[PDB]
Amino acid sequence: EFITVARPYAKAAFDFAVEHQSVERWQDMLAFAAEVTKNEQMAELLSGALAPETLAESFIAVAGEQLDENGQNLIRVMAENGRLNALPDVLEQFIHLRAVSEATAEVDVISAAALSEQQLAKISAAMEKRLSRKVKLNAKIDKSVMAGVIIRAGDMVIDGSVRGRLERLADVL
Amino acid sequence: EISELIKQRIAQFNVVSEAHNEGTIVSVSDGVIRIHGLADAMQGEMISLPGNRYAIALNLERDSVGAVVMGPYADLAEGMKVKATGRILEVPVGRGLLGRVVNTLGAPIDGKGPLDHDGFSAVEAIAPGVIERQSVDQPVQTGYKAVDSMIPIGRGQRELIIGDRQTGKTALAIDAIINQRDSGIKAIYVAIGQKASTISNVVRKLEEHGALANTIVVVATASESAALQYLAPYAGAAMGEYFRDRGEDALIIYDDLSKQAVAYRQISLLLRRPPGREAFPGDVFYLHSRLLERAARVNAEYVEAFTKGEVKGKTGSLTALPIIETQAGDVSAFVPTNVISITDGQIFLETNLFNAGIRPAVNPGISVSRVGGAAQTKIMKKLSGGIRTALAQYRELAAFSQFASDLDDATRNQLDHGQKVTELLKQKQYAPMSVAQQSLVLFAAERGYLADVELSKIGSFEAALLAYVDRDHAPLMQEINQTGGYNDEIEGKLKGILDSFKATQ
Amino acid sequence: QLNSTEISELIKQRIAQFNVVSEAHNEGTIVSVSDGVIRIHGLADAMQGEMISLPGNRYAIALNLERDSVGAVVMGPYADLAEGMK
Amino acid sequence: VKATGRILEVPVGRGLLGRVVNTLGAPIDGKGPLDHDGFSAVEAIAPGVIERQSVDQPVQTGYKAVDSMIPIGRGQRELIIGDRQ
Amino acid sequence: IIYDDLSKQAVAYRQISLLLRRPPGREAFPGDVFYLHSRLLERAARVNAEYVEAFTKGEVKGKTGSLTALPIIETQAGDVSAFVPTNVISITDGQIFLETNLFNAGIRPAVNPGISVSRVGGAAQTKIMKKLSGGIRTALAQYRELAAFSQFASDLDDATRNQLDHGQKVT
Amino acid sequence: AQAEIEAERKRAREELRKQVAILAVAGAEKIIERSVDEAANSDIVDKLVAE
Amino acid sequence: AQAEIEAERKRAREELRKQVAILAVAGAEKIIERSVDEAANSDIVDKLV
Amino acid sequence: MATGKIVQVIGAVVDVEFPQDAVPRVYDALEVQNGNERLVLEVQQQLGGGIVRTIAMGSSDGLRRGLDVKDLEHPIEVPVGKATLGRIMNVLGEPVDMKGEIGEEERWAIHRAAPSYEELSNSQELLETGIKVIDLMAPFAKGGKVGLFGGAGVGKTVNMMELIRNIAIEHSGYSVFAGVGERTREGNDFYHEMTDSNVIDKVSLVYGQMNEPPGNRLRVALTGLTMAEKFRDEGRDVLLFVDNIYRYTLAGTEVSALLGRMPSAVGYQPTLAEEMGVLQERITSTKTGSITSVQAVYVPADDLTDPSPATTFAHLDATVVLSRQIASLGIYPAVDPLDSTSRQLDPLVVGQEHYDTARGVQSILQRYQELKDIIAILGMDELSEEDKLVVARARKIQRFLSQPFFVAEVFTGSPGKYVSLKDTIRGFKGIMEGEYDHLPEQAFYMVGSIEEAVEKAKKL
Amino acid sequence: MATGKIVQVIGAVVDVEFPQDAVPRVYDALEVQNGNERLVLEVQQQLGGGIVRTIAMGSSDGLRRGLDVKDLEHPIEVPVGKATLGRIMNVLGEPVDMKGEIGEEERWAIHRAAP
Numbered sequence A: 001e002f003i004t005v006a007r008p009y010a011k012a013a014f015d016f017a018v019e020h021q022s023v024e025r026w027q028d029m030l031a032f033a034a035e036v037t038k039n040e041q042m043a044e045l046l047s048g049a050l051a052p053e054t055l056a057e058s059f060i061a062v063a064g065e066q067l068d069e070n071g072q073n074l075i076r077v078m079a080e081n082g083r084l085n086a087l088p089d090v091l092e093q094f095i096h097l098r099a100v101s102e103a104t105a106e107v108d109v110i111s112a113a114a115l116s117e118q119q120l121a122k123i124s125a126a127m128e129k130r131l132s133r134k135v136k137l138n139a140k141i142d143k144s145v146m147a148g149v150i151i152r153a154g155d156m157v158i159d160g161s162v163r164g165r166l167e168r169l170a171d172v173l
Numbered sequence B: 001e002i003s004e005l006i007k008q009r010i011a012q013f014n015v016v017s018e019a020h021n022e023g024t025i026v027s028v029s030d031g032v033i034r035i036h037g038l039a040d041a042m043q044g045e046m047i048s049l050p051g052n053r054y055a056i057a058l059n060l061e062r063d064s065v066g067a068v069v070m071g072p073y074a075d076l077a078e079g080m081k082v083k084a085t086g087r088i089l090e091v092p093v094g095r096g097l098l099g100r101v102v103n104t105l106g107a108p109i110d111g112k113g114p115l116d117h118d119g120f121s122a123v124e125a126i127a128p129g130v131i132e133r134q135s136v137d138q139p140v141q142t143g144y145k146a147v148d149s150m151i152p153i154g155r156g157q158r159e160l161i162i163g164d165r166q167t168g169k170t171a172l173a174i175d176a177i178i179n180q181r182d183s184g185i186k187a188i189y190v191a192i193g194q195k196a197s198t199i200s201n202v203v204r205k206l207e208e209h210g211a212l213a214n215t216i217v218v219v220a221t222a223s224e225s226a227a228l229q230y231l232a233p234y235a236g237a238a239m240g241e242y243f244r245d246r247g248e249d250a251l252i253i254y255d256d257l258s259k260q261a262v263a264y265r266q267i268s269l270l271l272r273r274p275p276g277r278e279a280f281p282g283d284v285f286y287l288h289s290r291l292l293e294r295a296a297r298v299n300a301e302y303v304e305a306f307t308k309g310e311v312k313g314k315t316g317s318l319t320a321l322p323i324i325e326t327q328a329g330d331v332s333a334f335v336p337t338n339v340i341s342i343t344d345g346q347i348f349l350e351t352n353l354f355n356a357g358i359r360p361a362v363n364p365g366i367s368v369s370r371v372g373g374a375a376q377t378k379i380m381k382k383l384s385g386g387i388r389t390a391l392a393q394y395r396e397l398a399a400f401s402q403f404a405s406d407l408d409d410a411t412r413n414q415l416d417h418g419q420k421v422t423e424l425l426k427q428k429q430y431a432p433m434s435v436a437q438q439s440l441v442l443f444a445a446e447r448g449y450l451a452d453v454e455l456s457k458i459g460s461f462e463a464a465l466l467a468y469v470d471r472d473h474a475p476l477m478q479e480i481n482q483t484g485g486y487n488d489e490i491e492g493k494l495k496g497i498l499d500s501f502k503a504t505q
Numbered sequence C: 001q002l003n004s005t006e007i008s009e010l011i012k013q014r015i016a017q018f019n020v021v022s023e024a025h026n027e028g029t030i031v032s033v034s035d036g037v038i039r040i041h042g043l044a045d046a047m048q049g050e051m052i053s054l055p056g057n058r059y060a061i062a063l064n065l066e067r068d069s070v071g072a073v074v075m076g077p078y079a080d081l082a083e084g085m086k
Numbered sequence D: 001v002k003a004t005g006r007i008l009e010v011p012v013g014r015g016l017l018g019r020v021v022n023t024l025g026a027p028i029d030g031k032g033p034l035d036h037d038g039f040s041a042v043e044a045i046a047p048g049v050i051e052r053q054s055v056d057q058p059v060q061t062g063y064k065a066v067d068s069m070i071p072i073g074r075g076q077r078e079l080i081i082g083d084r085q
Numbered sequence E: 001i002i003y004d005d006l007s008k009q010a011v012a013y014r015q016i017s018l019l020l021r022r023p024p025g026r027e028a029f030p031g032d033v034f035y036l037h038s039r040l041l042e043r044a045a046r047v048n049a050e051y052v053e054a055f056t057k058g059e060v061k062g063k064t065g066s067l068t069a070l071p072i073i074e075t076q077a078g079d080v081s082a083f084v085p086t087n088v089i090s091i092t093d094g095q096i097f098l099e100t101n102l103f104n105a106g107i108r109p110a111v112n113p114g115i116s117v118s119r120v121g122g123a124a125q126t127k128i129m130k131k132l133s134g135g136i137r138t139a140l141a142q143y144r145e146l147a148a149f150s151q152f153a154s155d156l157d158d159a160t161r162n163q164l165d166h167g168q169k170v171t
Numbered sequence F: 001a002q003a004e005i006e007a008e009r010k011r012a013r014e015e016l017r018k019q020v021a022i023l024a025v026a027g028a029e030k031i032i033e034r035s036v037d038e039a040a041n042s043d044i045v046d047k048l049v050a051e
Numbered sequence G: 001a002q003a004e005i006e007a008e009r010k011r012a013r014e015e016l017r018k019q020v021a022i023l024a025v026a027g028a029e030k031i032i033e034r035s036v037d038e039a040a041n042s043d044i045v046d047k048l049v
Numbered sequence H: 001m002a003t004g005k006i007v008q009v010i011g012a013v014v015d016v017e018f019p020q021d022a023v024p025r026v027y028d029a030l031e032v033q034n035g036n037e038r039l040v041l042e043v044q045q046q047l048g049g050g051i052v053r054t055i056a057m058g059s060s061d062g063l064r065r066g067l068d069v070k071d072l073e074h075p076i077e078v079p080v081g082k083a084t085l086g087r088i089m090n091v092l093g094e095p096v097d098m099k100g101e102i103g104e105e106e107r108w109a110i111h112r113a114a115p116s117y118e119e120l121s122n123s124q125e126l127l128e129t130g131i132k133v134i135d136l137m138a139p140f141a142k143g144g145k146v147g148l149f150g151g152a153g154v155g156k157t158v159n160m161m162e163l164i165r166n167i168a169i170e171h172s173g174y175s176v177f178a179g180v181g182e183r184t185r186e187g188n189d190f191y192h193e194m195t196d197s198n199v200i201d202k203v204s205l206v207y208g209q210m211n212e213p214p215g216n217r218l219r220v221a222l223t224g225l226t227m228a229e230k231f232r233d234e235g236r237d238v239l240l241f242v243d244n245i246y247r248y249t250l251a252g253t254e255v256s257a258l259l260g261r262m263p264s265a266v267g268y269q270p271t272l273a274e275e276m277g278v279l280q281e282r283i284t285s286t287k288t289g290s291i292t293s294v295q296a297v298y299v300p301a302d303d304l305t306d307p308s309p310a311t312t313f314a315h316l317d318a319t320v321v322l323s324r325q326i327a328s329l330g331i332y333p334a335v336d337p338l339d340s341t342s343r344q345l346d347p348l349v350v351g352q353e354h355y356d357t358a359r360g361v362q363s364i365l366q367r368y369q370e371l372k373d374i375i376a377i378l379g380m381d382e383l384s385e386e387d388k389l390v391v392a393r394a395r396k397i398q399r400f401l402s403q404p405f406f407v408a409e410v411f412t413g414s415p416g417k418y419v420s421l422k423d424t425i426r427g428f429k430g431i432m433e434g435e436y437d438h439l440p441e442q443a444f445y446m447v448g449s450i451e452e453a454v455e456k457a458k459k460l
Numbered sequence I: 001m002a003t004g005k006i007v008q009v010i011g012a013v014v015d016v017e018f019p020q021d022a023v024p025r026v027y028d029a030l031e032v033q034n035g036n037e038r039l040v041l042e043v044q045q046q047l048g049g050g051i052v053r054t055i056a057m058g059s060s061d062g063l064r065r066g067l068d069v070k071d072l073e074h075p076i077e078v079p080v081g082k083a084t085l086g087r088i089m090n091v092l093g094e095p096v097d098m099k100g101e102i103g104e105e106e107r108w109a110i111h112r113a114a115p
């Protein structure tokens, strides 16, 4: 695991994407590079002791659908230091950075039954007012909740499931 | 019976949800857990683990939080959810837990019901300032003749019982606690790393030979996590600091501060912090220093402002008696030298005196009291000045004694009187001695009433003197115990008592 | 893994210009200052034992020529120095 | 590099008596090849507790101090320790 | 079997371990030095006849195989406290100490009784040697105590004189 | 002796109280399973989403 | 006295098993704030004793 | 089905990668086919995403990267009960005596918590032993811990064999012997001795020897404790003999660094105190049953300052300190009477007479030690006549501490002696009071009671 | 305006991150609003990337990982002159006595070159 390695390259990439008005393109290009990172035979090549420049060219060759500024240079700079496995991490970092700048929160909810649109709309507005962002709710129908809902906004969470209240009363007892 | 109680406890419940921060366990190892998330975590916070266990957020790294588990850690797992509470570590305080045995978190291990504390206090707190502190000129009687005569302790002082293994450190500490049965001084015993059965023996001794009602017993055995042992003395310090700032006096004992240092070493090394002289972290001095500088005597204005005017003129205090174990008597080791610099006066317990049967095995010349005679009561101060000189002369002259005869009679008497005054300063374990009893025994030594009785009977002689004095001259005992005063009439009355006793057995 | 003297704006200049020789080989920028030892980035024209001229009338002696950085020691008061000084 | 799936084995037998051999089994005395009774593995495990037998037979050093005060028996493990020379 | 120098084996293993970037321990030796010497030395043993008969697939019957081992260790200026000698001393069934002082004094072989013992003991001797060596062992050890205790007494009790002279004879 | 007996009484009474509390809360869980539905779920949600 | 209070515990076990039914329904109704259906009570006996 | 794959094999430490759901938890067991050999791994750390770092309970040789691993969802579990009596077992509770299956009724996990503080039971039921100096200087009670401290070759094993003979035979309860890091020969000799004496039917044996990889030497002590605690929970009084606590700590030290830990003061692991405490706080006498334990403690370089003996001193009721000095001088057992003590040596717990006798002996020997160098340099006749009397009595007393053992009969060629405690007190009281001032020093050496001393004096 | 963020807290050591133009000099002083109190940090090392490593001139408890840090351009400055006579002060030049404010006319930095 190399989150901290991904943060420098991810900051460089994101800071560059807003200088050239192509955040939406940069995100999918980073996804493209991550898919290259996932390949079995490419992974063996990455495990080899090739020199960084020739390894970077072997990597570039399978990713011709990349721009000069974005792909050919970031791949080679990462290859100089062997941090190509950080591409998967850079992608997630890049998404979070974007969500910060655009004042958005990917608030996640879980429910024992499907919510009506009015209920979901009230929850959306209520979290936009609890927070200071445009929320984007996504729901999952899990019977483990038994009833009530879960609301997660990253690290923060609000639990309204009856299972939580049941076991809370059990711990009060 | 059980309903109604359970009914009211059902009514004490909340149905609506609450917002809080949720972290995820990344790694578990050796009592330390690595937690991802909790961007709102803070230095020294409590993180709530599943199972009602708490962890302390020590390391805040850029992409992870390193927390130490206060409890069993073997079942925690990667991917588990932990909730951050916003609390720096709190523990219960009050008179309701006076007389009970608890753990570092304050939960009772007594098996005799829950606590009725009056409130909570933070484990970490800053010490009183320079202008808020008062000079120590009140006595703390430990009940041992040698310590109370040569190495006096005052209300607010920080004495150090330093010695080797099996020399009487625990005994001296618990006998001080026992001697505070009837003073206004509350007592606290902190058992760090002690094996459980020894703690049980000490507890039974405390209730058996006196009052455990006056003492809080903090227990952290060798089987509990390093964080709990590390923070046990600080929790005890919080409990004592309550009394300190309430206008009342207290006495706390830290058993084996070296083992607390060991626990801190383990915690620091598992968090990858850089090591020092004996692998201890760089701030071990800042561990014991900020632990001990909370023990002080406090002036009336501080305590009156703190108590918000509940009491107006009193001055509270918290006397401390930490314990240190040297190895083969090495005083230059890192932890002992740190503690010796931090404290003011040490009671040094030498091992070859203990093996010789001279118990308690305090050693003059090396053991001093930096607070001086301002901590002694007047009668103990008057009758103890010459004991120092007699012993000092004895030390050097006795080396010559073993192979010498036909000596100057002044040196002969100096030597022999030193030998018998050395004989006098020793007593059984669980027998503490009041100020009057110690006073008259020291008076018998100093005024020469033992000079013709310089033989093996001295112990029986002391017992018979105490029995006789109890039999017929009690009023002076009461007056001395109440006042601690000394003057010409008291001097002559003591002379009369000794003169009368010499007639008896 | 470690962050081996790689940072965002240097990376972004490499992103804009993959070959670094666009800047003169006679100059570099201070990247770290630690208790007297200084760490310059650049200076492709540097050899061990040189007298690297800092801003002001101060000198630093090149000691280590690494893969990507030059390590030197400051001769004089070093506390005035910051990142990015040419 | 090929990986021959076999652990290190050494020549062993009665024909080694009187021969000077290196760690891999190659003679260095120059008196011809070995006459070994098969090979055996260098790294093996020891017999267990149930497979042992006690020591009650002597082996003579030929010296007086050793054979008298500090006797050695067949199956014993003796540490000869001291300074240089 | 003689292991002429276990310490040099330990040094070679230390070099291998450090070149492999394994974590170092006390005196830079890796922790598995004890494992090295232990798994080596415990291979020396005596095995019962059932084991021999099972191994040889019935060819050899009624015989116990045996291998005796004599490892050798070099101490630097007699520092027994060092890591490798501590481990090896802990493993073996006995010790034979050779000392520079005794060697220079002319006592060769330079064996020091009282610091050298054999745990197999009297069982590892012929009955005659067992009988006779029993007394020698105590005699020399207490001789050295008397010799230290009575350096300066010009005249002495002749019981201690007899033991002193007899210890001189045996030495 | 009487103090020890009183402490034992207190301990045992708490022990049995906790056992029966376990039983009661488990029964409550099964009751919830036997009684909860979508209308109750929406009622609970509307009491929750106010905050 | 210890034997005496052991018998006391037996009595209390039987007495509080009657209470656990009340407490179970009380908790269930409290946590959903609604009048619990008195139906399908076939399993209450195993929870009772 | 198999669920994990090996990714690293460094020395004795193995890393296994699992799916990020259902990762094995700490102290679990895992299984892998090392060729034809079934190999068990024990999980020690949950680290990284889906990876656990483990220790092999067997030889790590023959392992390849990519081998499948099957995760058993329990810790290492061992047979417990009467079926373990008379059988030798390894760390995993597998028979190594070639008598067949154990035949157990119940199996118990070796990782378990210590008794709660209110479970502890107080005891002062003094045991009597035939050894003079131990009963005099450090008597101990049923249900307590005993530790025999000593350097290399000072008499730990011989004393433990003597104590087994003296205590266990009169004991009617079951006993457990945990051979932690023992020499193979001495384990075989112990097994055959018990088999001949017909006491093997009440002893359970767990042997993890010097040759085995570090994990076995690390966990064999926990196996022994598990068996002893089963007997304790049945309500019986148990005798537990542990051959070396030192090599439990040492087996920890070997693998500590490979687990990623930073080294401690003297190269030990940072977790020495906790690793000692978790093991040693389980060896206690609870209200249901009592475990009485005797432990042999190695002293590196014969220096009691080392952290291992230093920490284990703080866990014991009675500590018999053997010294290489007294062993080299030829006094056997080599107990140091000045260092050895017991917390049962109270005038209340023992006879008041017994306490005074012990105190006087210690005082006299302490006074001799200071005079040793005085006399050595300046001469015997510089002393006063009272000092010369003290020197005489000191040497006689220091002889009377010696004793022949039944199990030390092979080394010396003499019968073994058993002395009752009353006789020991009587003899030392007589010597200190001068009733035997006129006998020579050897009249007390290697004898039993003081009546035997006067008989040998007549022969002298 | 405060221009920095905390990135780590390990014991008494605090690492904070600034823009690459605003990186403090080696012995500069920084101030943070920890709880309600103000905490002074003294910079010790300039690591790469705008991070500087500092020692907290006070209690480190209660510090989060996102707090804003104000960058003072001078080192620790203390009151000097005749007004300091008869007063007790801490390291930062503030009264640990209770008599009141020190009426200084001049404040000097504690770091300077020798004569």
Ligand SMILES: Nc1ncnc2c1ncn2[C@@H]1O[C@H](COP(=O)(O)OP(=O)(O)OP(=O)(O)O)[C@@H](O)[C@H]1O
Binding pocket: B163, B164, B165, B166, B167, B168, B169, B170, B171, B172, B325, B359, B360, B427, B428, B429, H314, H342, H343
């Ligand atoms: N005055 C005394 N008279 C008799 N025995 C005493 C006296 N003081 C202490 N002892 C004895 O000394 C022994 C050790 O006592 P204590 O536990 O207090 O020592 P210690 O130095 O604190 O030991 P450790 O570090 O091992 O806990 C006990 O057996 C106790 O009975």
Ligand SMILES: Nc1ncnc2c1ncn2[C@@H]1O[C@H](COP(=O)(O)OP(=O)(O)O)[C@@H](O)[C@H]1O
Binding pocket: E117, E118, E119, E120, E121, H150, H151, H152, H153, H154, H155, H156, H157, H158, H159, H332, H333, H405, H408, H411, H412
């Ligand atoms: N009581 C005794 N009588 C005779 N010889 C002894 C006695 N105690 C120890 N020894 C000798 O010292 C040797 C070393 O002690 P032993 O107990 O075998 O190993 P350790 O002391 O290392 O456990 C014994 O094998 C024996 O040779």
Ligand SMILES: [Mg+2]
Binding pocket: B166, B168, B169, B170, B171
């Ligand atoms: Mg003690």
Ligand SMILES: [Mg+2]
Binding pocket: H156, H157, H296
């Ligand atoms: Mg042994």
